[PDB]
Coordinates of C-alpha atoms in Angstrom, one line a residue:
Chain A
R4 CA 29.2 58.8 -1.2
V5 CA 31.9 57.8 -3.7
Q6 CA 33.3 60.1 -6.3
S7 CA 36.1 59.5 -8.9
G8 CA 38.1 61.1 -11.7
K9 CA 41.4 61.1 -13.5
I10 CA 44.2 63.7 -13.6
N11 CA 46.0 63.7 -17.0
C12 CA 49.4 65.3 -16.4
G13 CA 50.9 65.0 -19.9
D14 CA 54.4 65.7 -21.0
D15 CA 56.8 66.8 -18.3
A16 CA 58.1 69.7 -20.4
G17 CA 54.9 71.5 -19.1
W18 CA 55.5 70.4 -15.5
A19 CA 56.7 72.8 -12.8
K20 CA 60.2 72.8 -11.4
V21 CA 59.7 72.6 -7.6
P22 CA 62.0 72.6 -4.6
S23 CA 62.8 69.1 -3.4
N24 CA 61.5 67.9 0.0
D25 CA 63.6 64.7 0.0
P26 CA 67.4 65.1 0.6
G27 CA 67.8 62.2 -2.0
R28 CA 66.0 63.9 -5.0
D29 CA 67.3 66.6 -7.3
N30 CA 65.6 68.3 -10.2
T31 CA 62.2 67.5 -8.7
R32 CA 59.3 68.4 -10.9
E33 CA 55.5 68.1 -10.6
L34 CA 52.2 68.7 -12.3
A35 CA 50.2 69.4 -9.1
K36 CA 46.5 69.7 -9.2
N37 CA 44.1 71.1 -6.6
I38 CA 40.9 69.1 -7.3
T39 CA 37.6 70.1 -5.8
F40 CA 34.8 67.5 -5.4
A41 CA 31.5 68.1 -7.2
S42 CA 29.7 67.2 -4.0
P43 CA 31.5 68.6 -0.9
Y44 CA 32.0 66.2 2.0
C45 CA 31.3 66.6 5.7
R46 CA 34.7 65.3 6.7
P47 CA 37.8 64.5 4.6
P48 CA 37.0 61.4 2.6
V49 CA 39.6 58.7 2.1
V50 CA 41.3 59.3 -1.3
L51 CA 43.2 56.7 -3.3
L52 CA 45.5 57.4 -6.2
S53 CA 46.2 55.0 -9.0
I54 CA 48.6 55.6 -11.9
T55 CA 46.6 54.4 -14.9
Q56 CA 48.8 55.8 -17.7
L57 CA 52.5 56.0 -18.3
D58 CA 54.8 56.8 -21.1
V59 CA 58.4 57.1 -19.9
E60 CA 61.8 57.4 -21.7
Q61 CA 63.7 54.2 -21.6
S62 CA 67.3 55.5 -21.7
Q63 CA 66.8 56.8 -18.2
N64 CA 65.5 55.4 -14.9
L65 CA 61.8 55.2 -14.3
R66 CA 61.2 57.7 -11.4
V67 CA 57.5 58.5 -10.6
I68 CA 55.3 59.3 -7.7
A69 CA 51.5 59.7 -7.6
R70 CA 51.6 62.1 -4.7
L71 CA 48.6 62.9 -2.4
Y72 CA 49.3 66.1 -0.4
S73 CA 46.1 66.8 1.4
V74 CA 42.4 66.0 1.6
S75 CA 39.9 68.4 2.9
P76 CA 36.1 68.0 3.0
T77 CA 35.9 70.0 -0.3
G78 CA 38.8 68.7 -2.4
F79 CA 42.4 67.5 -2.4
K80 CA 45.8 68.2 -3.7
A81 CA 47.7 65.6 -5.7
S82 CA 50.5 65.6 -8.3
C83 CA 52.4 63.7 -10.9
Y84 CA 55.9 63.9 -9.5
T85 CA 59.3 63.0 -11.0
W86 CA 63.0 63.8 -10.4
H87 CA 66.6 63.6 -11.7
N88 CA 66.8 63.0 -15.4
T89 CA 63.6 60.9 -15.8
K90 CA 61.6 61.9 -18.9
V91 CA 57.9 61.3 -18.9
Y92 CA 55.8 61.8 -22.0
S93 CA 52.6 61.2 -20.2
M94 CA 51.1 60.1 -16.9
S95 CA 47.6 59.9 -15.6
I96 CA 46.3 59.3 -12.1
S97 CA 42.9 57.9 -11.3
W98 CA 41.3 58.6 -8.0
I99 CA 38.4 57.8 -5.8
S100 CA 37.0 59.6 -2.8
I101 CA 34.9 57.8 -0.2
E102 CA 33.0 59.2 2.7
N103 CA 34.6 57.7 5.8
Chain B
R18 CA 28.3 46.7 -1.8
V19 CA 31.9 46.4 -2.8
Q20 CA 33.3 43.9 -5.3
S21 CA 36.9 43.4 -6.6
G22 CA 39.0 41.3 -8.9
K23 CA 42.1 41.2 -11.1
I24 CA 42.5 41.1 -14.9
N25 CA 45.7 39.3 -15.9
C26 CA 46.5 40.3 -19.4
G27 CA 49.7 38.4 -20.0
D28 CA 52.1 38.7 -22.8
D29 CA 51.2 41.2 -25.6
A30 CA 51.8 38.7 -28.4
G31 CA 48.3 37.4 -27.5
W32 CA 46.9 41.0 -27.5
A33 CA 44.6 42.4 -30.1
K34 CA 45.7 44.9 -32.7
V35 CA 43.1 47.7 -32.5
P36 CA 42.5 50.9 -34.4
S37 CA 44.0 53.9 -32.6
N38 CA 41.6 56.5 -31.0
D39 CA 44.4 59.0 -30.3
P40 CA 46.0 60.8 -33.2
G41 CA 49.4 60.5 -31.3
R42 CA 49.4 56.6 -31.0
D43 CA 50.3 54.1 -33.7
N44 CA 50.4 50.3 -33.4
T45 CA 47.8 50.4 -30.6
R46 CA 47.1 47.0 -29.0
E47 CA 44.9 45.9 -26.2
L48 CA 43.7 42.9 -24.2
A49 CA 40.2 44.1 -23.5
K50 CA 37.9 42.4 -21.1
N51 CA 34.2 42.6 -20.6
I52 CA 33.8 41.8 -16.9
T53 CA 30.5 41.1 -15.3
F54 CA 29.9 41.5 -11.6
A55 CA 28.9 38.5 -9.5
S56 CA 26.2 40.6 -8.0
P57 CA 24.5 43.1 -10.4
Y58 CA 24.1 46.6 -9.3
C59 CA 21.1 49.0 -9.4
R60 CA 23.2 51.8 -10.9
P61 CA 26.7 51.9 -12.3
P62 CA 29.1 51.5 -9.4
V63 CA 32.2 53.6 -9.3
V64 CA 35.1 51.5 -10.6
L65 CA 38.8 52.0 -10.0
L66 CA 41.6 50.4 -11.9
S67 CA 45.1 49.8 -10.5
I68 CA 48.0 48.2 -12.4
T69 CA 49.4 45.7 -9.9
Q70 CA 51.7 43.8 -12.2
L71 CA 54.2 44.8 -14.9
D72 CA 56.9 43.2 -16.9
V73 CA 58.1 45.5 -19.7
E74 CA 61.0 45.3 -22.2
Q75 CA 63.7 47.8 -21.2
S76 CA 65.2 48.6 -24.7
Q77 CA 61.9 50.4 -25.6
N78 CA 59.8 53.1 -23.9
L79 CA 57.3 52.1 -21.2
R80 CA 53.9 52.8 -22.7
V81 CA 50.9 51.5 -20.8
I82 CA 47.3 52.4 -20.0
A83 CA 44.9 50.7 -17.7
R84 CA 41.8 51.7 -19.6
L85 CA 38.3 51.8 -18.3
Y86 CA 35.8 52.1 -21.2
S87 CA 32.4 51.8 -19.6
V88 CA 30.6 50.8 -16.4
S89 CA 27.0 49.5 -16.4
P90 CA 25.0 48.2 -13.5
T91 CA 25.9 44.6 -14.6
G92 CA 29.6 44.9 -15.5
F93 CA 32.4 46.9 -17.1
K94 CA 34.8 47.0 -20.0
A95 CA 38.5 47.6 -19.3
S96 CA 41.7 46.8 -21.0
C97 CA 45.5 46.5 -20.8
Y98 CA 46.5 49.0 -23.6
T99 CA 49.9 49.7 -25.2
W100 CA 51.2 51.3 -28.4
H101 CA 54.2 51.9 -30.7
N102 CA 57.1 49.4 -30.1
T103 CA 56.5 48.9 -26.4
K104 CA 56.9 45.2 -25.4
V105 CA 55.0 43.9 -22.4
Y106 CA 55.6 40.4 -21.0
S107 CA 52.8 40.8 -18.5
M108 CA 50.4 43.3 -17.0
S109 CA 47.6 42.9 -14.4
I110 CA 45.0 45.3 -13.3
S111 CA 43.2 45.1 -10.0
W112 CA 39.8 46.7 -9.7
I113 CA 37.1 47.6 -7.2
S114 CA 33.5 48.4 -7.8
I115 CA 31.5 50.4 -5.2
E116 CA 27.8 51.1 -5.1
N117 CA 27.4 54.9 -5.4
Chain C
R25 CA 34.3 51.9 7.4
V26 CA 37.1 52.8 5.1
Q27 CA 40.8 52.7 6.1
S28 CA 43.9 53.5 4.1
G29 CA 47.7 53.7 4.2
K30 CA 51.0 53.3 2.3
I31 CA 53.7 50.7 2.4
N32 CA 57.1 52.2 1.5
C33 CA 59.3 49.2 0.5
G34 CA 62.5 51.1 -0.4
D35 CA 65.6 49.8 -2.1
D36 CA 65.5 46.1 -3.0
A37 CA 69.0 45.5 -1.4
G38 CA 67.0 45.3 1.9
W39 CA 64.4 43.0 0.4
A40 CA 64.1 39.3 1.2
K41 CA 65.1 36.6 -1.1
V42 CA 62.1 34.2 -1.3
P43 CA 61.4 30.9 -3.0
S44 CA 59.5 31.4 -6.3
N45 CA 55.8 30.3 -6.6
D46 CA 55.7 30.8 -10.4
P47 CA 57.6 28.3 -12.6
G48 CA 58.5 31.3 -14.8
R49 CA 60.3 33.5 -12.2
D50 CA 63.8 33.1 -10.8
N51 CA 65.6 35.3 -8.1
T52 CA 62.2 36.3 -6.7
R53 CA 62.4 38.9 -3.9
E54 CA 59.9 40.7 -1.8
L55 CA 59.5 43.2 1.0
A56 CA 56.4 41.6 2.5
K57 CA 54.4 43.4 5.2
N58 CA 51.8 42.1 7.6
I59 CA 49.6 45.2 8.1
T60 CA 47.0 45.4 10.9
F61 CA 44.0 47.7 10.7
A62 CA 43.7 50.4 13.4
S63 CA 40.0 49.4 13.7
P64 CA 39.4 45.6 13.3
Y65 CA 36.7 44.5 10.9
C66 CA 33.9 42.0 11.4
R67 CA 34.6 40.3 8.1
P68 CA 37.5 40.6 5.7
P69 CA 37.2 44.0 4.0
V70 CA 37.9 44.4 0.4
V71 CA 41.5 45.7 0.0
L72 CA 42.9 47.4 -3.1
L73 CA 46.6 48.0 -3.8
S74 CA 48.0 50.8 -5.9
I75 CA 51.7 51.3 -6.7
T76 CA 52.1 55.0 -6.1
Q77 CA 55.9 55.2 -6.2
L78 CA 58.5 53.7 -8.4
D79 CA 62.3 54.1 -9.1
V80 CA 63.6 51.3 -11.3
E81 CA 66.9 50.7 -13.0
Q82 CA 66.6 51.3 -16.8
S83 CA 69.3 48.9 -18.1
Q84 CA 67.1 46.0 -17.0
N85 CA 63.4 45.1 -17.5
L86 CA 60.8 46.6 -15.3
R87 CA 59.4 43.6 -13.3
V88 CA 57.1 44.5 -10.4
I89 CA 54.1 43.1 -8.6
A90 CA 52.0 44.8 -5.8
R91 CA 51.1 41.5 -4.2
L92 CA 48.0 41.0 -2.0
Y93 CA 48.4 37.6 -0.1
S94 CA 45.5 37.6 2.3
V95 CA 42.9 39.7 4.1
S96 CA 41.6 38.9 7.5
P97 CA 39.2 40.9 9.6
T98 CA 42.1 42.3 11.5
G99 CA 44.8 42.9 8.8
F100 CA 46.3 41.8 5.6
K101 CA 49.5 40.6 4.0
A102 CA 50.9 42.4 1.0
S103 CA 54.3 42.8 -0.6
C104 CA 56.5 44.7 -3.1
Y105 CA 57.7 41.8 -5.3
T106 CA 60.3 41.6 -8.0
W107 CA 62.3 38.9 -9.8
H108 CA 65.2 38.1 -12.2
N109 CA 67.7 41.0 -12.6
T110 CA 65.3 43.9 -12.0
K111 CA 66.7 46.6 -9.8
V112 CA 64.3 48.7 -7.8
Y113 CA 65.5 51.7 -5.8
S114 CA 62.1 52.4 -4.3
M115 CA 58.5 51.3 -4.5
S116 CA 55.5 52.3 -2.5
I117 CA 52.0 50.8 -2.4
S118 CA 48.9 52.6 -1.3
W119 CA 46.0 50.7 -0.1
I120 CA 42.4 51.0 1.0
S121 CA 40.2 48.7 3.0
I122 CA 36.5 48.8 2.8
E123 CA 33.8 47.0 4.9
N124 CA 32.0 44.8 2.5
Chain D
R2 CA 19.2 55.4 0.9
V3 CA 16.5 56.3 3.5
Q4 CA 13.1 57.6 2.8
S5 CA 10.2 58.5 5.1
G6 CA 6.7 59.8 5.3
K7 CA 3.4 59.8 7.1
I8 CA 0.0 58.3 6.2
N9 CA -2.9 60.3 7.7
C10 CA -5.9 58.0 7.8
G11 CA -8.4 60.3 9.4
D12 CA -11.9 59.5 10.7
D13 CA -13.0 55.8 10.3
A14 CA -16.3 56.8 8.8
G15 CA -14.3 57.3 5.5
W16 CA -12.6 53.9 6.0
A17 CA -13.3 50.8 4.0
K18 CA -15.2 47.8 5.3
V19 CA -13.1 44.8 4.4
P20 CA -13.4 41.1 4.8
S21 CA -11.7 39.8 8.0
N22 CA -8.5 37.7 7.7
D23 CA -8.5 36.7 11.4
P24 CA -11.1 34.4 12.7
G25 CA -11.2 36.5 15.9
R26 CA -12.1 39.9 14.3
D27 CA -15.5 41.1 13.0
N28 CA -16.4 44.4 11.4
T29 CA -12.8 44.8 10.2
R30 CA -12.2 48.2 8.5
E31 CA -9.1 49.8 7.0
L32 CA -7.8 52.9 5.3
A33 CA -5.2 51.1 3.1
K34 CA -2.6 53.0 1.1
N35 CA -0.4 51.9 -1.7
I36 CA 2.6 54.2 -1.3
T37 CA 5.2 54.6 -3.9
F38 CA 8.8 55.7 -3.1
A39 CA 10.0 58.9 -4.7
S40 CA 13.3 57.0 -5.5
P41 CA 12.7 53.4 -6.5
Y42 CA 14.9 50.8 -4.8
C43 CA 16.8 47.9 -6.3
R44 CA 15.5 45.5 -3.8
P45 CA 12.7 45.7 -1.2
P46 CA 13.9 48.1 1.5
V47 CA 13.1 47.4 5.1
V48 CA 10.0 49.4 6.1
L49 CA 9.0 50.3 9.6
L50 CA 5.7 51.6 10.7
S51 CA 5.0 53.8 13.7
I52 CA 1.6 55.1 14.9
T53 CA 2.3 58.8 15.6
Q54 CA -1.3 60.0 15.9
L55 CA -4.4 58.6 17.7
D56 CA -7.8 59.9 18.6
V57 CA -10.0 57.0 19.8
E58 CA -13.5 56.9 21.4
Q59 CA -13.2 56.0 25.1
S60 CA -16.6 54.2 25.6
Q61 CA -15.2 51.3 23.5
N62 CA -12.0 49.3 23.4
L63 CA -8.9 50.6 21.7
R64 CA -8.4 48.3 18.8
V65 CA -5.8 49.4 16.2
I66 CA -3.2 47.9 13.9
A67 CA -0.6 49.7 11.8
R68 CA -0.5 47.1 9.1
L69 CA 2.3 46.5 6.6
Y70 CA 1.1 44.2 3.8
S71 CA 4.0 44.2 1.3
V72 CA 7.1 46.0 0.3
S73 CA 8.4 46.0 -3.3
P74 CA 11.4 47.8 -4.7
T75 CA 9.0 50.6 -5.9
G76 CA 6.6 51.0 -2.9
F77 CA 4.6 49.4 -0.2
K78 CA 1.1 48.7 1.0
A79 CA 0.1 49.6 4.5
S80 CA -3.1 50.4 6.4
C81 CA -4.8 51.9 9.4
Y82 CA -6.8 48.9 10.6
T83 CA -9.5 48.6 13.2
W84 CA -12.4 46.1 14.1
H85 CA -15.5 45.4 16.1
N86 CA -17.1 48.6 17.6
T87 CA -13.9 50.6 18.0
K88 CA -14.3 54.2 16.9
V89 CA -11.2 56.1 15.7
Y90 CA -11.4 59.8 14.9
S91 CA -7.9 59.9 13.6
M92 CA -4.8 57.8 13.2
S93 CA -1.5 58.6 11.5
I94 CA 1.3 56.3 10.7
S95 CA 4.9 57.4 10.1
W96 CA 7.2 55.2 8.1
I97 CA 10.8 54.8 7.0
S98 CA 12.3 52.8 4.2
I99 CA 15.9 51.7 4.3
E100 CA 18.0 50.1 1.5
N101 CA 19.0 46.7 2.9
Chain E
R18 CA 25.6 57.1 11.1
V19 CA 22.6 56.2 13.2
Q20 CA 21.7 57.8 16.5
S21 CA 18.8 57.1 18.9
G22 CA 17.1 58.1 22.2
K23 CA 13.9 58.5 24.1
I24 CA 12.0 61.6 25.2
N25 CA 10.1 60.9 28.5
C26 CA 7.4 63.6 28.7
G27 CA 5.7 62.5 31.9
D28 CA 2.5 63.8 33.4
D29 CA 0.6 66.4 31.3
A30 CA 0.2 68.7 34.4
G31 CA 3.8 69.7 33.7
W32 CA 3.1 70.2 30.0
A33 CA 2.8 73.6 28.3
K34 CA -0.4 75.1 27.1
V35 CA 0.1 76.1 23.5
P36 CA -1.9 77.9 20.8
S37 CA -3.6 75.4 18.5
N38 CA -2.5 75.1 14.9
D39 CA -5.5 72.9 13.8
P40 CA -8.9 74.5 13.7
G41 CA -10.3 71.2 15.1
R42 CA -8.3 71.1 18.4
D43 CA -8.9 73.2 21.5
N44 CA -6.9 73.1 24.8
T45 CA -3.8 71.9 22.9
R46 CA -0.9 71.1 25.2
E47 CA 2.7 69.8 24.5
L48 CA 5.9 68.9 26.2
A49 CA 8.2 70.0 23.3
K50 CA 11.9 69.1 23.3
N51 CA 14.7 70.6 21.3
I52 CA 17.1 67.6 21.0
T53 CA 20.6 68.0 19.8
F54 CA 22.5 65.0 18.3
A55 CA 25.7 64.0 20.1
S56 CA 27.4 63.8 16.6
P57 CA 26.2 66.6 14.3
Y58 CA 25.2 65.6 10.8
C59 CA 26.2 67.1 7.5
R60 CA 22.6 67.2 6.3
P61 CA 19.3 66.7 8.1
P62 CA 19.1 63.0 8.9
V63 CA 15.8 61.2 8.6
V64 CA 14.2 61.0 12.0
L65 CA 11.5 58.6 13.1
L66 CA 9.3 58.9 16.1
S67 CA 7.8 56.0 18.0
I68 CA 5.5 56.2 21.1
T69 CA 6.9 53.6 23.4
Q70 CA 5.1 54.5 26.5
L71 CA 1.6 55.5 27.4
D72 CA -0.5 56.0 30.5
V73 CA -3.8 57.7 29.6
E74 CA -7.0 58.3 31.6
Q75 CA -9.8 56.0 30.5
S76 CA -12.9 58.2 31.2
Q77 CA -11.9 60.5 28.3
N78 CA -10.8 60.0 24.7
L79 CA -7.3 58.9 23.9
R80 CA -5.8 61.9 22.0
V81 CA -2.1 61.9 21.4
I82 CA 0.4 62.9 18.7
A83 CA 4.2 62.2 18.6
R84 CA 5.0 65.4 16.8
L85 CA 8.1 66.0 14.7
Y86 CA 8.5 69.8 14.0
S87 CA 11.9 70.1 12.3
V88 CA 15.2 68.3 11.7
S89 CA 18.4 70.2 11.2
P90 CA 21.9 68.8 10.8
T91 CA 22.5 69.4 14.5
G92 CA 19.2 68.4 16.1
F93 CA 15.5 68.3 16.0
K94 CA 12.3 69.5 17.6
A95 CA 9.7 67.0 18.6
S96 CA 6.8 66.9 21.2
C97 CA 4.3 64.9 23.1
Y98 CA 1.1 66.6 22.1
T99 CA -2.5 66.3 23.4
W100 CA -5.7 68.3 23.3
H101 CA -9.3 68.8 24.6
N102 CA -9.9 66.9 27.9
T103 CA -7.5 64.0 27.4
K104 CA -5.4 63.2 30.5
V105 CA -2.0 61.6 30.1
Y106 CA -0.1 60.4 33.1
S107 CA 3.0 59.5 31.0
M108 CA 4.2 59.3 27.4
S109 CA 7.6 58.5 25.9
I110 CA 8.8 58.8 22.4
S111 CA 11.7 56.8 21.0
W112 CA 13.5 58.1 18.0
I113 CA 16.2 57.3 15.5
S114 CA 18.2 59.6 13.3
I115 CA 19.8 58.2 10.1
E116 CA 22.3 59.9 7.8
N117 CA 20.5 60.1 4.4
Chain F
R9 CA 22.9 45.8 7.5
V10 CA 19.2 46.3 8.5
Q11 CA 17.1 43.6 10.0
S12 CA 13.4 43.8 11.2
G13 CA 10.6 41.8 12.8
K14 CA 7.5 41.8 15.0
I15 CA 6.9 40.4 18.5
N16 CA 3.3 39.4 18.9
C17 CA 2.7 39.4 22.7
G18 CA -1.0 38.5 22.7
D19 CA -3.4 38.4 25.6
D20 CA -1.9 39.5 29.0
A21 CA -3.4 36.4 30.8
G22 CA -0.4 34.6 29.3
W23 CA 2.0 37.3 30.4
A24 CA 4.5 36.9 33.3
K25 CA 4.0 38.6 36.6
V26 CA 7.3 40.4 37.3
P27 CA 8.7 42.5 40.2
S28 CA 8.3 46.2 39.6
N29 CA 11.4 48.4 38.9
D30 CA 9.6 51.6 39.2
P31 CA 8.3 52.7 42.7
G32 CA 5.2 54.0 41.0
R33 CA 4.0 50.8 39.4
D34 CA 2.3 47.8 41.0
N35 CA 1.1 44.5 39.4
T36 CA 3.8 44.9 36.7
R37 CA 3.5 42.3 34.0
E38 CA 5.5 41.5 30.8
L39 CA 5.8 39.2 27.9
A40 CA 9.6 39.5 27.5
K41 CA 11.4 38.2 24.5
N42 CA 15.0 37.4 23.9
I43 CA 15.3 37.9 20.1
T44 CA 18.4 36.8 18.2
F45 CA 19.3 38.3 14.8
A46 CA 19.4 36.0 11.8
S47 CA 22.8 37.7 11.0
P48 CA 24.9 38.5 14.0
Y49 CA 26.4 42.0 14.2
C50 CA 29.9 43.1 14.9
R51 CA 28.7 45.7 17.4
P52 CA 25.3 46.4 19.0
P53 CA 23.1 47.8 16.3
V54 CA 20.7 50.5 17.0
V55 CA 17.3 49.0 17.7
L56 CA 14.0 50.8 17.5
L57 CA 10.7 49.6 18.8
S58 CA 7.2 50.5 17.5
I59 CA 3.9 49.3 18.9
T60 CA 2.0 48.3 15.8
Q61 CA -0.9 46.5 17.4
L62 CA -3.1 47.2 20.4
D63 CA -6.3 45.9 21.9
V64 CA -6.9 47.3 25.3
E65 CA -9.9 47.2 27.8
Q66 CA -11.7 50.5 27.9
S67 CA -13.0 50.4 31.5
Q68 CA -9.5 50.8 32.8
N69 CA -6.5 53.1 32.0
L70 CA -4.3 52.4 29.0
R71 CA -1.0 51.6 30.5
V72 CA 1.7 50.1 28.1
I73 CA 5.4 50.2 27.4
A74 CA 7.3 48.8 24.5
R75 CA 10.4 48.1 26.6
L76 CA 13.9 47.7 25.2
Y77 CA 16.2 46.1 27.8
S78 CA 19.5 45.4 26.0
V79 CA 21.1 45.1 22.6
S80 CA 24.1 42.9 22.0
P81 CA 25.8 42.2 18.7
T82 CA 23.8 38.9 18.5
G83 CA 20.3 39.9 19.7
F84 CA 18.2 41.9 22.1
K85 CA 15.8 41.7 24.9
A86 CA 12.5 43.6 24.6
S87 CA 9.0 43.2 26.2
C88 CA 5.3 44.2 26.1
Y89 CA 4.9 45.7 29.5
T90 CA 1.8 46.7 31.5
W91 CA 0.9 47.4 35.1
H92 CA -1.9 48.0 37.7
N93 CA -5.4 46.9 36.4
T94 CA -4.8 47.5 32.7
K95 CA -6.1 44.7 30.6
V96 CA -4.6 44.1 27.2
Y97 CA -6.1 41.6 24.7
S98 CA -3.2 42.0 22.3
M99 CA -0.1 44.0 21.6
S100 CA 2.6 43.7 18.9
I101 CA 5.9 45.5 18.6
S102 CA 7.7 45.9 15.4
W103 CA 11.4 46.5 15.4
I104 CA 14.4 47.3 13.3
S105 CA 18.1 46.8 13.9
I106 CA 20.7 48.9 12.1
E107 CA 24.5 48.5 12.0
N108 CA 25.8 51.6 13.5

C-alpha cells in the first residue's frame, strides 16, 4: 500500500520561529505539518521526502532541510526548515509512504 | 513492480518557453518529458520525483520545480521547470514508479 | 521489503578530491559512502536518492549531485558530489531501497 | 491482490454429461463453472483449487477431480468432475487467486 | 505476509457432537479449532483450507467438510466436520493466510 | 512471487514401498517428488498442497496423505502417501509457492 502527496510550504514570512535543536543553527524557522494518511497503516510505513520546489534569495546562503520528525501508522510529521538569514519564497516537499 | 530512471534536462538554453500557469511566474520555461515505462502498469503507479542534480547561476535567485503533470498506466509526464531570470546549467530528476 | 536511511555528508572541507569523470567538471569532490542494508536482498533493490539537506555558499554557483554509483543485493554506493568552486557547508541524502 | 471463493457443485444428478478427454474415462460428468473475479486482474493470477467438501457413495469407487481449465485476467473456468459409476451427493471446491 | 499450518483432527471418537446447521445433515460432528496467527494481521487475511490427510471407513459413505467459520485479523475458526454414520479415523487440514 | 504446479502420482503399483515413520501405519507407500522451482527463491516460500484428483478402491478404507517434507529456497519435497491395504488408481496434488 503506497500513498503520496506534496506539502507546499510557501513564503517563509508565514513560517514559525522555533527553538533550535542544533547548536550550530540560529534563527531556525519551520513550516511543520502533521499529515495523516487517507488509509491508516498497521505499522509505520517508510516515508521518503523529496524537495520538488524551491525559490530562494540569492544574496544569502541556501539553507534548507526537508525534515521528517516521526512516522506513525496513521500519519507523519515533516517540515520545511531553514535558519540564519536564508530567505525562501517557496518550498515544496513531495512524499511517499510505503507499507513495510 | 517498481521501476526507476533519471531525466537529465541539461542547460536551460535548450529548454522550451511555455505559457505560465501561475499568476506569480513570468518567463516560465520547461524541459518536459513524456516518459513511458518499460513494463506497462494495470493502474497508474505512484510516481515520486527527486532532483538529484543541480547547477544554477548564483547572481540570480534559485527557482526550480520538479514537476509531475500526469501518471497513466503506461507512462508519465514530468518536467524541469524554471521561471523569471533564473539560469540553470543543468538539472536532473530521478524517479520511481510503484504499483499501488 | 523496504529499507531507508540518510547519509549526512557535512562540510566539503572533509570531502575527498577525486578525478573527474565528466570532461566538463574540474575540481570534482565527493563524500562517497558504501552503504550496506541491514537485511540483504535477493536481487538489487531499486534505490532512490533525495537531497534533504543543503547549506551552500551564495557567492558561487550551486553545483551538486546526489550520485548513485551501484546497487548490489547487499548494499549500494552513493555520494555527495560537487565541483569547480562550489562551497557546501552541509548536504544530506535520504534514500529508500525497495525489493523489485 | 488476493481473492477467494467456493464453488458448491451439489448432487451429480444435476451435473452435465460431457465427452471424455482421457482415453481411460467413460461416463465423464462435470459441474463446470465460469467464475469471474470481482476485481479484474492485469495478468492471469495464479489460482489454486481445494476440495473442501465431499459426500460420495461408498458402494462404488471414489473418483473425483477438481479441475482447473483456464485462468484469464478476468476469471477462470473450473469444474467438479467425476466418471464411470461414481456417485457424488455433494462436492465443493474452494479457491484463491493471487496476482503474480 | 503469508502464514501457514496444519490442523490434525484425528479420530472422530474424540470429536464433538454439535447441532446441525443444515436441514439435510443429522449426527453432525466436528473437531473445531480456534487458531491464532503468530503475527496478527491488520485486516482479515484470506484463508484457504486444504484437506491433506484422510482415513475413512469404507463400509459407509465418505462425508467430510473442511469448514472455515470466520477469519479475523488475529486468527480464524475452522473445523473437521462430518455427519450421519461416516467414520473418520483421521483428517488433517492445511491452511494458508495471506495479507489482502 | 507466486509459482504453482501439479504432481500427478498415478497408480500406486508404480509407487515406492517405504519404511513407516508412524507406529500406527504398516505397508506405507509413496510417490515422492523433489520439485524445483523455475525461479529460485531467496528464502523458503510458503508451500500449500491440495489433493485435486483421486481414484480409490472402494472395498478398502480411503487412506491418503498429501505430504510436504521440506521447502528450500530452490524447491521442495512432497509425496502422495498411502498405507495398509488402500488401493489408489490415481492421485494428483496441486501446489502453490509464495514468497514470504
